[PDB]
RNA sequence: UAUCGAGAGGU
DNA sequence: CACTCTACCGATAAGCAGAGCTACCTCTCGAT
DNA sequence: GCTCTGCTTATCGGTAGAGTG
């Protein structure tokens, strides 16, 4: 591969099965080649042993960890990012009506992939900002929604239950005094249904969906998309409501100068993406592209009403060229 | 002070788009939708948090 | 001599820690207690070197 | 780091006690600076009090609204700023005249307390409390957050004519208010200086700005022991002041000139 | 007590206006210039101690020397207004007084502000000139500062002599803004030049010229 | 050296330790050699110097360019004046001497 | 200290009974009202000390990162405790130490 | 101990490009389901069963950033969880973090956590072992043999409770001795050798771990420098 | 004897 | 002759977008 | 990705004057 400027890569085959529901009222298909990291478990060099390493012109001091793409040895650089699924509280600059913000990036456990990001902002500066209330940010909603409103839209409506999820100390009068503006700014929303509708009326979607579904659209933005690392099945809003209160609690501990703001550079709050996660994020993008090419091919080849041979609807160049391109140029994407 | 706002909503009757005007009187908690074309009017209660999309939503449910 | 003089400078820093922790430390104008503490500790350690 | 250099009249500059008097009069002190805590009680009888601490105070004093505003002053900060309970209550009176009944305890009391009442009113007292801490100025020049007492060694000729040193007291501030501090009796109004040459330009004019600009640049260069010949810095400060206003060494200054377009577009 | 600082500051603003007038070339008697604070209080305050601004107004004429040098120097009217906020009503009576008595320049000291509407009555009164000062801004005479060297207005003849010596157009001299504190103190008008003699650490003395915008 | 861990500079110290050794005093000389704590603390100060050199070089380089463009056309003329390309007088005599 | 309505669980707001001249805590979503035990309605602390000691838990002696001292406990007179400066994260916070005896778990000072 | 303090490029990338220290590792990722099962088996109560009035002293428990339960005796819970990891019952790369002050117990099976190994010091005051290294010349003997007395290498030490991995978050809660000699107090005055810190702020130290060797804070490149402890740090 | 980029480096 | 009731220009911020970010030098590598 | 300044939009009064009782 080095000598002849070839790519050292393994063919990947995937079983595919067709089915045709009809109501009057395949096998080992090749999807692309994946470049193999030398001396890994999937490299033809992992066995052999010094005798045959020398016969393969391989140096026993070469420990691998790199790929061969068009003859060139490419190494992946560990990519540093912030940890997912952790709450961090930061302070905001002076010329802003917001003074403290809590943030969390939600990411699933399987695959490990980002999903969405959410914020809870405390408005009102120091003796500036009038009403000092607290609004949240929801995925796919155009405007910040006061905290009390989203608590009610989740099934906890009386003031006393909402505050029992946030403040865990009936004696803490400083924190309770700081929650005052949030209650009064969410006074007119006195039940779950008008809460869910208050949300749905800003979350993009279509114009003119009546209360009967624009609620049911907001019920989706809460079940999925909102803190999806907690759960995405229905009827588990008890886990999400308690977490929302935890965030607000953490937000206020810092605003009361009882706790320092989080240190974005603390290495324990950081993660390094190596070959696996880096390849997986790219393979996900490219396999969806292959997926869309399969769907687009059925709509032309099925208008003929001819049994499609599948292997004629999978161009393995989509995955093979995508992976080759990113490893060859260093541009990690399409 | 009253708020006179133009919107990009479609009138439910005459179907002219970008011709619904919303007048929100918060001092008396009374919101008013008006059509700049066919001239109809719809009234509904508003709170302090409401916006032209809140009463236009109430107008869709008042018809159906 | 060098090792002795550094040892005595470390002791002065102990005294300064004691005063600041027993509310017996002079506050310099325009400075919080902790700023004044760090300033006194810094002058002591730089003079030791 | 905004800062004023406040030279004092000679009689004050050689008497540390008189210089301290100028110091305490210049430093800005708000009501928020001396207040430790504020409270709002429901004390319905104006001539008595549910507060056991202020019992003997109001009973003897008497020999309006039921809501009480009770604020406590911190003894340490009241001592540092050199403020008496009387004058703190006086300043409150002046801004609230007859719309507020003010009652203050003596400086000998265990807690320093000021009681206030208006002459639905639960919220009106919170609005008043916010306005008081945020606007009431007890003394000093606004913008002067701290005043330091600095000793100057100034070389002045003898009676024999020989130059000898002479120690004189002056003041230096955090924050600036050159115009107001110049007017303060005691301050040598012919020498007061500010390290904001923008402020010098508004108070003293362009030729004074020229000198102040040079002084501030020289201070930067000379600090690490360096030395640049006068004519180079003089040339730069004349360029920055030739238009009659301060031309910044940025495109917003430089390219506001009537110079050719080819020259200006090459920057 | 606190009433004494009001009288003192007003007396200091008053001394500055006289100083300003003297430097601009007008004649002020050496008895009114040296007027103590006590004499000021006796003449200006009521029995209750409150001062009457309308009693502070005065008129002055150029000295013979100043009139020989500057032939554009007329009669000057200085008036302190008893009304803190000077509105369109107050300014009109002042502009009428200036034209009727045909003063060349009138200096109007206000207390708190001048409304922008009344401020437009200022350029409608030519060839007479109205200048405004906030009474605060005059408590200290800024030209007495170490950093402000002596500015001296050039005569029309002296200016021409300067331009020819350097073969200069007017736009090639260094400038001083009309609103410059020292330009306002001298009442500089567009086109007039000040000469400024200045300490120099390389030559001892250096003459700087600026022309008024 | 700041408490980059919770109330301490390194996991080798107890919390709330303000002693010389806890916050970066290097007692040893280069002859004797630095301890592991001193080594790291010295490398923290040293990194800051490499960062400063890499950063502030562009800060002052832009400053010098703006200074040059502000002043590039200013010349001493045969009448002794210092002028720009418009013939405006910047100084009536260079350096006042 | 503000309380909650016994029938609606929403928070009670202070309201005067003008005729009897007494402080009540009334609800705002229903007709419930109750008598106030405390005349104080509002407090604002500028110079605060809340959160000074903060997390003193039964297992604070198990945190091996805390320094240990010999100071004699006022309660049980044990010669073994852990200490820490104020947990208030303000810039003007004092540096005076809080000690926690590992025996009786009392929080004392060196005053 | 996680990235090299010396090896970083000069110039624009300075401090942004880093290099793994010699003993660093990166977490591969581990399933959380076995962690949940152990927590519920040893006393964790669900969040639907939870009231702050009833749980005014209990510890909140997080697993990969989701609040999953509360436990009333956290001191026993963490010791149990830690001992499962020190034997291999839990994957050694899992993070076990007790924040005692904040009453929080956090567990991470996340991929991408940077960790390093340390010697375990016996911390239980119920045995003469306490205060000393758990590792003995017997472990060192079996390491040199390659086999146990009924392969024995690095991971054998990790699953026999004498060495464990800690990441940056768990490192926040431990007390590390710099060398084995620092585990015990001493009686020097040799003017040639270097001065060791006094450590006189705490009367008695309770070490939980000990560094294997402090030179392992360096990466590949800086490990080539002879006597880097005698150089001005930029030269390294 | 190409062009557009990227990356790693030198003082 | 005492009142409001609205058409003015101040003086506000006020929000915003973009403009700019040391000098010179080496080499390899991929895409068009 | 971060600092600055200038330029283009809302808010603020502020009067300043006819309509008024
Ligand atoms: N990134 C950069 N940008 C601009 N100029 C640079 C530069 N890096 C180096 N230089 C030039 O090279 C000089 C650096 O010289 P070096 O050899 O790097 C250090 P020194 O200060 O001369 O010696 P030392 O090694 O004894 O400390 C700078 O002063 C400058 O002249
Ligand atoms: Zn219509
Ligand atoms: Zn109720
Ligand atoms: Zn005890």
Q: Whose C1' is closest to the CA of H10: which nucleotide?
A: I9
Domain with G67, as residue range(s), is 45-111
User: From the list G65, G70, G87, which residue is nearest H203 (CB)?
Assistant: G70
- Segments making up each domain of chain B, as ranges: 1-64
Residues of C with Cβ-Cβ distance to D151 under 8 angstroms: none
Strand J footprint at Cβ < 7 Å?
A: A 69-70, 72, 324-325, 328-329; D 251; E 116, 120; F 54, 57-58, 61-62, 65; H 11-12
| Residue owning tokens 């102990």 | C14
> How many CB atoms sit inside 10 A of residue E183's CB?
23
User: How far is Cα D71 from Cα D133, in angstroms, rounded to an integer?
Assistant: 10
Q: A114 touching H, CB under 8 A?
A: no
User: How far is Cα A146 from Cα A153, in angstroms, rounded to an integer?
Assistant: 11
Backbone φ, ψ for residue D145 (5° rounding): -80, -35
DSSP 8-state assignment for residue E136: G
User: How far is Cα D51 from Cα G40, in angstroms, rounded to an integer?
Assistant: 10
Residues of G with Cβ-Cβ distance to A160 under 8 angstroms: 4-5, 9-11
DSSP 8-state assignment for residue B17: B
H-state helical runs in chain B? 52-63
Report the candidate in D71, D100, D69 with the shortest Cα–Cα distance to residue D85.
Answer: D71
Note whether G16 and G63 are same-domain residues: no
DSSP 8-state assignment for residue H234: G
How many domains does chain G fold into?
2
The size of chain A, in residues, is 334
Rg (alpha carbons) of chain B, rounded to whole number = 11
DSSP 8-state assignment for residue D215: H
Ligand 1: distance of its center to the CA of D226 in Å?
20
Domain with E135, as residue range(s), is 1-140
User: From the list G15, G16, G47, which residue is nearest D74 (CB)?
Assistant: G47
Tell me if F14 and G65 make a contact (CB, 8 A cut-off).
Answer: yes
What is the chain D residue with the closest CA to C30? Answer: D146
Strand K footprint at Cβ < 7 Å?
A: D 248, 250, 252; E 85, 87-89, 113, 115, 117-118
DSSP 8-state assignment for residue H155: H
User: How far is Cα A12 from Cα D107, in angstroms, rounded to an integer?
Assistant: 88
- Subunits in contact with chain F (3 or more CB pairs closer than 8 Å): C, D, E, G, H
Output the six-digit token pair for A279: 């390849």
Question: What resolution in Å is listed for this PDB structure?
Answer: 3.0
Note whether E47 and E128 are same-domain residues: yes
3-class SS at E133? strand
Please answer whether residues D39 and D115 qualify as being in contact, where contact means their C-beta atoms are separated by less than 8 angstroms.
no
Report the candidate in H129, H95, H132, H137 with the shortest Cα–Cα distance to residue H112.
Answer: H95
Question: Looking at CA atoms only, how far is residue E208 from chain F in angstroms?
Answer: 7
Handedness of CA A129, A130, A135, A141 (dihedral sign): negative
What is the chain A residue with the closest CA to D133? Answer: A127
DSSP 8-state assignment for residue A270: E
Note whether G14 and G67 are same-domain residues: no
User: From the list B9, B54, B64, which residue is nearest A201 (CB)?
Assistant: B54
| Residue owning tokens 């809003």 | A237
Tell me if A210 and B48 make a contact (CB, 8 A cut-off).
Answer: no
Q: The domain that contains G55 carries what CATH number?
A: 2.20.25.10
User: Which strand J nucleotides have any atom less than 7 A from protein CB atoms?
Assistant: 9-11, 19-23, 29-31
Tell me if E202 and F90 make a contact (CB, 8 A cut-off).
Answer: no
Note whether G21 and G57 are same-domain residues: no
Q: Which residues of F touch H (CB under 8 A)?
A: 5-6, 11-14, 16-17, 19, 21-22, 27-28, 30-37, 39-40, 42-47, 49-51, 54
H-state helical runs in chain H? 33-41, 74-87, 137-145, 154-158, 168-171
CATH class of the B1-64 domain in this structure: mainly beta
Note whether E84 and E167 are same-domain residues: no
Note whether E159 and E195 are same-domain residues: yes
Q: Whose C1' is closest to the CA of A329: which nucleotide?
A: J30
In whole angstroms, how far apart are CA D144 and each of C15, D17, D23, D29, D79?
35, 21, 11, 9, 19
Question: Looking at CA atoms only, how far is residue A258 from chain H in angstroms?
Answer: 12
User: How far is Cα D213 from Cα D239, in angstroms, rounded to an integer?
Assistant: 11
**Chains B and F share 3 or more Cβ pairs within 8 Å:** no
Render H12-40 in DSSP notation, one character per residue: TTBTTB--B-TT-EE-----SHHHHHHHH
In whole angstroms, how far apart are CA D6 and each of C23, D149, D160, D204, D235?
34, 10, 29, 15, 29
For chain E, the straight-line distance linking the first and the last C-alpha, in angstroms and rounded, comes to: 44
Note whether E112 and E168 are same-domain residues: no
How many domains does chain E fold into?
2
Output the six-digit token pair for H157: 């030490």
Ligand 2: distance of its center to the CA of H220 in Å?
76
Burial annotation D151-164 (CB, 10 A radius, 16+ → b, else e): eeeeeeeeeeeeee
Q: D106 touching A, CB under 8 A?
A: no
Please answer whether residues E80 and E54 qualify as being in contact, where contact means their C-beta atoms are separated by less than 8 angstroms.
yes
Question: Looking at CA atoms only, how far is residue C26 from chain H in angstroms?
Answer: 23
What strands, in cross-sheet order, belong to the sheet with G68-69?
G68-69, G81-85, G97-101, G107-108
Which CATH architecture is the domain D19-139 placed in?
2-Layer Sandwich (3.30)
Ligand 1: distance of its center to the CA of E51 in Å?
71
Tell me if G57 and H207 make a contact (CB, 8 A cut-off).
Answer: no
Residues near C7 by beta carbon (within 8 Å), at least 6 away in sequence: none
CA D136 to chain centre: 14
* Residue G6 in marked binding region: yes
Question: Looking at CA atoms only, how far is residue G56 from chain F in angstroms?
Answer: 15
Ligand 4: distance of its center to the CA of D28 in Å?
48
> Angle at CA D201, nearest 5°, toward D196 and D202?
100
Structural element, H or E, at residue A119: strand A114-123
Note whether E126 and E61 are same-domain residues: yes
What is the chain H residue with the closest CA to C4? Answer: H189
User: Per 3-state DSSP, what percentage of chain C is helix, strand, and coil (rounded to 5)?
Assistant: 75, 0, 25
User: From the list H75, H103, H204, which residue is nearest G68 (CB)?
Assistant: H204
Tell me if F86 and D231 make a contact (CB, 8 A cut-off).
Answer: no
Q: Which of G14, G23, G37, G45 to probe by mutation at the D interface, max D CB count within 10 Å? A: G23
Ligand 4: distance of its center to the CA of G69 in Å?
12
Residues near G32 by beta carbon (within 8 Å), at least 6 away in sequence: G5, G6, G7, G8, G12, G26
User: How far is Cα B7 from Cα B21, in angstroms, rounded to an integer?
Assistant: 6
Report the candidate in D52, H204, D11, H183 with the shortest Cα–Cα distance to residue G64.
Answer: H204
User: How far is Cα H4 from Cα H21, in angstroms, rounded to an integer?
Assistant: 5
Beta pairing, strands G68-69 & E151-153: unpaired
Note whether E133 and E40 are same-domain residues: yes
Q: G91 touching C, CB under 8 A?
A: yes
Beta pairing, strands D67-73 & D112-118: antiparallel
Question: Looking at CA atoms only, how far is residue H55 from chain G in angstroms?
Answer: 14
Residue at shortest CA–C1' distance from J31? A329
Output the six-digit token pair for E1: 């007590």
Tell me if E174 and F79 make a contact (CB, 8 A cut-off).
Answer: no
User: Which strand I nucleotides have any atom less than 7 A from protein CB atoms?
Assistant: 5-11
User: How far is Cα C28 from Cα C34, in angstroms, rounded to an integer?
Assistant: 10
User: How far is Cα A79 from Cα A83, in angstroms, rounded to an integer?
Assistant: 12
H-state helical runs in chain F? 36-71
Beta bridge partners of G25: G14, G34
Q: E195 touching F, CB under 8 A?
A: no
Please answer whether residues A235 and A228 qualify as being in contact, where contact means their C-beta atoms are separated by less than 8 angstroms.
no
User: Which strand K nucleotides have any atom less than 7 A from protein CB atoms?
Assistant: 5-6, 14-17
């Amino acid at each position: 591969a080095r000598l002849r400027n070839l790519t050292y890569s393994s063919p990947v085959y995937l079983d595919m099965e067709k089915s045709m529901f009809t109501s009057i009222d395949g096998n080992k298909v090749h999807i692309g080649k994946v470049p193999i990291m030398l001396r890994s478990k999937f490299c033809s060099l992992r066995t052999l042993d010094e005798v045959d390493l020398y016969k393969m012109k391989e140096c026993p001091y070469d420990m691998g960890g790199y790929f061969v793409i068009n003859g060139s040895e490419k190494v992946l650089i560990a990519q540093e990012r912030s940890a997912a699924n952790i709450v961090q509280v930061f302070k905001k600059a002076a010329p802003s009506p917001i003074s403290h913000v809590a943030e969390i990036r939600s990411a699933l456990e399987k695959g490990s992939r980002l999903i969405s990001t959410m914020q809870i902002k405390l408005y009102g500066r120091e003796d500036k900002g009038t009403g000092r209330t607290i609004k949240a940010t929801l995925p796919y909603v155009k405007q910040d929604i006061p905290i009390v409103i989203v608590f009610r839209a989740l099934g906890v409506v009386p003031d006393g239950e909402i505050l029992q999820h946030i403040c865990y100390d009936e004696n803490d009068w400083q924190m309770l005094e700081m929650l005052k503006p949030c209650i009064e700014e969410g006074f007119v929303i006195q039940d779950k249904e008008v809460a869910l509708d208050f949300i749905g009326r800003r979350g993009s979607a279509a114009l003119g969906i009546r209360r009967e579904k624009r609620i049911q659209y907001a019920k989706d933005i809460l079940q999925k998309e909102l803190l999806p690392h907690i759960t995405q099945e229905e009827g588990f809003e008890t886990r999400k409501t308690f977490f929302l209160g935890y965030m607000v609690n953490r937000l206020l501990l810092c605003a009361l100068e009882r706790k320092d703001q989080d240190d974005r550079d603390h290495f324990g709050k950081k993660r390094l993406d190596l070959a696996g996660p880096l390849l997986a994020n790219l393979f996900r993008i490219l396999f969806r592209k292959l997926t869309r090419e399969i769907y687009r091919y059925m709509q032309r080849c099925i208008e003929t009403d001819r049994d499609f041979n599948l292997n004629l609807a999978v161009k393995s160049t989509t995955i093979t060229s995508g992976l080759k391109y990113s490893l060859a140029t260093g541009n990690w994407g399409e | 002070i009253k708020q006179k706002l133009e919107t990009q909503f479609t009138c439910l009757f005459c179907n002219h788009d970008n011709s619904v005007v919303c007048t929100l009187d918060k001092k008396n908690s009374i919101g008013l939708l008006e059509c700049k074309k066919c001239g109809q009017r719809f009234q509904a209660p508003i709170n302090s948090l409401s916006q032209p999309i809140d009463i236009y939503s109430d107008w869709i449910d008042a018809c159906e | 001599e060098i090792t002795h003089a550094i040892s005595s400078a470390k002791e002065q820093v102990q005294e300064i820690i004691y005063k600041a922790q027993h509310n017996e430390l002079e506050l310099k104008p325009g400075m919080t207690l902790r700023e004044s503490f760090e300033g006194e500790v810094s002058r002591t350690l730089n003079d030791a070197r | 780091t905004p800062a004023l250099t406040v030279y004092l009249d000679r009689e004050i500059a050689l008497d540390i006690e008189k210089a301290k008097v100028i110091q305490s009069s210049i430093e800005y002190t708000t009501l928020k600076n001396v207040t430790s805590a504020t409270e709002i009680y429901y004390d319905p009888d104006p001539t008595s009090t549910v507060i056991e601490e202020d019992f003997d105070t109001v009973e003897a004093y008497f020999s309006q609204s039921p809501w009480l505003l009770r604020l406590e002053l911190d003894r340490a900060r009241m001592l540092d700023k050199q403020l008496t309970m009387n004058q703190v209550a006086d300043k409150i009176s002046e801004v609230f005249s007859d719309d507020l009944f003010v009652m203050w305890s003596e400086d000998n009391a265990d807690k320093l307390i000021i009681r206030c009442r208006v002459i639905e009113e639960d919220q009106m007292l919170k609005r008043i409390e916010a306005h008081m801490l945020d606007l009431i100025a007890l003394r000093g020049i606004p913008g002067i957050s701290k005043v330091y007492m600095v000793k100057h060694k100034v070389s002045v000729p003898d009676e024999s004519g020989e130059y000898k040193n002479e120690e004189l007291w002056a003041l230096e501030t955090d924050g600036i208010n050159l115009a107001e501090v110049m007017a303060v009796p005691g301050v040598d109004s012919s020498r007061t200086y500010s390290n904001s040459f923008v402020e010098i330009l508004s108070v003293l004019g362009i030729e004074a700005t020229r000198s102040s600009l040079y002084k501030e640049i020289l201070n930067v260069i000379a600090f690490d022991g360096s030395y640049v010949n006068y004519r180079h810095m003089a040339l730069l400060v004349d360029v920055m002041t030739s238009r009659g206003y301060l031309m910044a060494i940025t495109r917003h200054g430089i390219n506001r000139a009537d110079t050719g377009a080819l020259m200006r577009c090459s920057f | 007590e606190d009433n004494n600082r009001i009288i003192s500051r007003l007396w200091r603003s008053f001394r500055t206006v006289k100083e300003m007038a003297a430097d601009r070339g007008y004649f002020i008697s050496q008895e009114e210039m040296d007027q103590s604070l006590e004499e000021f209080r006796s003449k200006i305050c009521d029995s209750m101690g409150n001062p009457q601004r309308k009693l502070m107004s005065f008129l002055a004429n150029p000295t013979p020397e100043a009139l020989e040098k500057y032939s554009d120097l007329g009669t000057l009217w200085v008036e302190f207004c008893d009304e803190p906020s000077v509105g369109i009503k107050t300014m009109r009576n002042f502009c009428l007084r200036i034209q009727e008595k045909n003063f060349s320049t009138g200096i109007f000291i206000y207390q708190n502000n001048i409304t922008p509407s009344a401020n437009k009555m200022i350029p409608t009164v030519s060839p007479a000139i109205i200048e405004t000062f906030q009474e605060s801004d005059l408590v200290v005479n800024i030209t007495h500062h170490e950093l402000v060297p002596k500015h001296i207005r050039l005569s029309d003849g002296e200016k021409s002599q300067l331009l020819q010596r350097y073969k200069l157009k007017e736009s090639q001299l260094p400038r001083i803004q009309r609103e410059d504190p020292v330009a306002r103190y001298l009442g500089l008008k567009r086109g007039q030049v000040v000469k400024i003699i200045r300490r120099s650490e390389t030559s001892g003395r250096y003459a700087s010229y600026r022309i008024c915008l | 050296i700041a408490f980059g861990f919770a109330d301490r500079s390194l996991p080798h110290f107890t919390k709330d330790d303000f002693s010389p050794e806890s916050k970066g005093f290097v007692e040893n000389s280069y002859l004797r050699g630095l301890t592991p704590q001193e080594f790291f603390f010295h490398a923290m100060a040293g990194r800051e110097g490499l960062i400063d050199t890499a950063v502030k070089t562009a800060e002052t380089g832009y400053i010098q360019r703006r200074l040059v463009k502000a002043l590039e056309d200013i010349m001493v003329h045969y009448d002794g004046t210092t002028r720009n390309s418009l013939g405006d007088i910047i100084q009536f005599l260079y350096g006042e001497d | 200290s503000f309380r909650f309505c016994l029938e609606c669980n929403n928070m009670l707001y202070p309201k005067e009974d003008k005729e009897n001249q007494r402080l009540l805590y009334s609800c705002r979503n229903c007709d419930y009202t109750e008598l106030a035990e405390d005349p104080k309605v509002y407090r604002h602390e500028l110079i605060t000390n809340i959160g000074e000691t903060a997390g003193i838990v039964d297992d604070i002696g198990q945190d091996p990162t805390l320094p240990r001292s010999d100071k004699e406990c006022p309660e049980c007179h044990s010669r073994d405790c852990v200490f820490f400066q104020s947990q208030q994260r303000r810039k003007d916070t004092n540096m005076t130490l809080f000690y926690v005896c590992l025996n009786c778990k009392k929080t004392f000072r060196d005053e | 101990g996680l990235v090299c303090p010396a090896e970083t490029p000069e110039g624009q990338a300075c401090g942004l490009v880093k290099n793994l220290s010699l003993l660093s590792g990166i977490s591969i990722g581990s399933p959380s389901e076995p962690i949940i099962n152990f927590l519920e088996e040893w006393g964790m109560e669900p969040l639907e069963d939870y009231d702050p009035a009833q749980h005014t002293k209990s510890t909140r428990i997080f697993v990969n950033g989701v609040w999953t339960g509360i436990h009333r005796d956290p001191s026993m819970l963490v010791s149990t969880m830690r001992d499962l990891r020190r034997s291999g019952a839990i994957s050694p790369e899992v993070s076990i973090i007790r924040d005692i002050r904040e009453r929080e117990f956090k567990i991470f099976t996340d991929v991408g956590r940077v960790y390093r190994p340390l010697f375990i010091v016996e911390d239980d005051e119920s045995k003469d072992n306490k205060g000393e290294l758990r590792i003995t010349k017997e472990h060192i003997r079996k390491i040199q043999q390659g086999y146990d007395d009924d392969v024995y290498g690095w991971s054998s030490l990790v699953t026999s409770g004498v060495i464990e991995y800690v990441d940056g978050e768990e490192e926040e809660t431990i007390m590390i001795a710099m060398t084995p000699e620092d585990l015990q107090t001493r009686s020097l005055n040799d003017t040639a050798k270097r001065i060791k810190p006094e450590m006189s702020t705490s009367s008695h130290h309770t070490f939980t771990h000990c560094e294997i060797h402090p030179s392992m804070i360096l990466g590949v490149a800086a490990s080539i420098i002879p006597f880097p402890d005698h150089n001005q740090s930029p030269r390294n």
